[PDB]
Amino acid sequence: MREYKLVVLGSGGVGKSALTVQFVQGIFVEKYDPTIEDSYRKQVEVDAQQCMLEILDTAGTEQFTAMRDLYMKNGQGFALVYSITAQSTFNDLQDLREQILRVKDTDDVPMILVGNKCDLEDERVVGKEQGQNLARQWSNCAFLESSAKSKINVNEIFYDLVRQIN
Ligand SMILES: Nc1nc2c(ncn2[C@@H]2O[C@H](COP(=O)(O)OP(=O)(O)NP(=O)(O)O)[C@@H](O)[C@H]2O)c(=O)[nH]1
Ligand SMILES: [Mg+2]
């Protein structure tokens, strides 16, 4: 079966681990905080094609490890995650995407922009239009708002990322 090596990146606390675990294992981590940059496997079918996904849950950017450039070079597709409740985490993604393109030495890189914590509408600071505008600036329309807690668009992040790799 075709295998897809995916990498989840973003600033600290945005829900990288929560999204990965919700997708792969169907459970919400609550306050449990993985401290390993681990990989998580799940088989799916996207557009009538079977896919084995292996998803790497990276450390928050503030706390990035010596392995990060390896991940950026070798990953086949990237989910760049922010929280809709923290503008800093959103703006941080511009530099982060630039780093990936620098490492890859091309702009042709499968990527999805993910505004997580969409269940926290009362605490929103990043507008949905802001996310759409960033995706447009990147010339890549793949953009979702998600909630690892409520299971909104969680599977779709990974399906849509697969669609770009295909
Ligand atoms: N309300 C809400 N909370 C969330 C969501 N995702 C994660 N969280 C919460 O935000 C906190 C951090 O989540 P976590 O998945 O560990 O984030 P992370 O990006 O992996 N952090 P780190 O960069 O340190 O590894 C946790 O308290 C978690 O329960 C979400 O979609 N909605
Ligand atoms: Mg984490």
Swiss-Prot record:
UniProt-annotated stretches for the region Interaction with KRIT1:
25-67
A GO MF annotation of the entry reads: GTPase activity
The entry's function note states: GTP-binding protein that possesses intrinsic GTPase activity. Contributes to the polarizing activity of KRIT1 and CDH5 in the establishment and maintenance of correct endothelial cell polarity and vascular lumen. Required for the localization of phosphorylated PRKCZ, PARD3 and TIAM1 to the cell junction. Plays a role in the establishment of basal endothelial barrier function.
**Location(s), subcellular:** Cell membrane; Cytoplasm, Cytosol; Cell junction
Name this polypeptide is given? Ras-related protein Rap-1b
- Chain residues that bind GTP: 10-18, 57-61, 116-119, 147-149
Recorded hits in InterPro entries, A to Z, give: P-loop_NTPase (IPR027417), Rap1 (IPR038851), Small_GTP-bd (IPR005225), Small_GTPase (IPR001806), Small_GTPase_Ras-type (IPR020849)
Per its UniProt record, what SMART domains does this chain match? RAB, RAN, RAS, RHO
Identify residues that carry ADP-ribosylserine. Answer: 39
An annotated GO cellular component: plasma membrane
* Gene this protein is translated from: Rap1b
Enzyme category, top tier: hydrolase
Q: Name the catalysed reactions.
A: GTP + H2O = GDP + phosphate + H(+)
- What do we know about how this protein assembles, alone or with others? Heterodimer with RAP1GAP. Interacts with EPAC2. Interacts with SGSM1. Interacts with SGSM2. Interacts with SGSM3. Interacts with KRIT1. Interacts with RAP1GDS1.
UniProt note on regulation of activity: Activated by guanine nucleotide-exchange factor (GEF) EPAC2 in a cAMP-dependent manner.
Q: Which organism is it from?
A: Rattus norvegicus (Rat)
